[PDB]
Design a protein around this ligand. Structure first.
Ligand SMILES: O=C(O)c1sc(CCCc2ccccc2)nc1-c1ccccc1
Length: 188
């Protein structure tokens, strides 16, 4: 067929009950994730093709970058709690990988301050149990799919995107094939 289990996607042996509809995992330490977000804009092109009533979830992971990787997962939780993802995604990717000016939790915090999140608002979120819960949520979803690498994307806790089994020749073609595959999967 045109879409095949094992080709553009794979099928989890242990499907995940109740998982988010479209679930993306990334790390601000992950160079391929930088490309996905800054150059390919995968998340946004997937969204632009998703059926109505399907929501996209994006979680950070701990397994890259050691101590700072874990701080970034907490900072992504802060970004979600405040709803400022679109304000800090780029400067976090660039601070970690382009300028390499993010070396500590304080440098992470500076990015939010520079984006206009007030210092008191960031600190209260950072220390909140709402944020502790979002951290564990991100960790649980990654654990549930036994996530070893990023970037990754899952649909309905059943299908894992396989960007290698796609037509990877052209890149704009690549993005749209990735996005059409997610649409197809979300329609199964
Ligand atoms: O598995 C993956 O992550 C992907 S994604 C992709 C196509 C993206 C092209 C591109 C454009 C701009 C910047 C970076 C990359 N190819 C692969 C691949 C991986 C292992 C072996 C062969 C192919």
């Amino acid at each position: 067929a045109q879409y095949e289990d094992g080709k553009q996607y794979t099928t989890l042996e242990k499907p995940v009950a109740g998982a988010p509809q479209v679930l993306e995992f990334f790390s601000f330490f992950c160079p391929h994730c930088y490309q996905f977000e800054e150059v390919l804009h995968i998340s946004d092109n997937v969204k632009k093709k998703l059926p109505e009533g399907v929501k996209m979830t994006k979680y950070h992971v701990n397994f890259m970058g050691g101590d700072l990787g874990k701080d970034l997962t907490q900072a992504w939780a802060v970004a979600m709690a405040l709803g400022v993802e679109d304000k800090v995604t780029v400067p976090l990717f660039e601070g970690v990988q382009k300028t390499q000016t993010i070396r500590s939790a304080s440098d992470i915090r500076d990015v939010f301050i520079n984006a206009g999140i007030k210092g008191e608002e960031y600190d209260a979120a950072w220390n909140s149990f709402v944020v502790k819960s979002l951290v564990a949520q991100q960790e649980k979803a990654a654990a549930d799919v036994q996530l070893r690498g990023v970037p990754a994307m899952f649909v309905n806790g059943k299908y894992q995107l396989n960007p290698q089994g796609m037509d990877t020749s052209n890149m704009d073609v690549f993005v749209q094939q990735y996005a059409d595959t997610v649409k197809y999967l979300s329609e199964k």
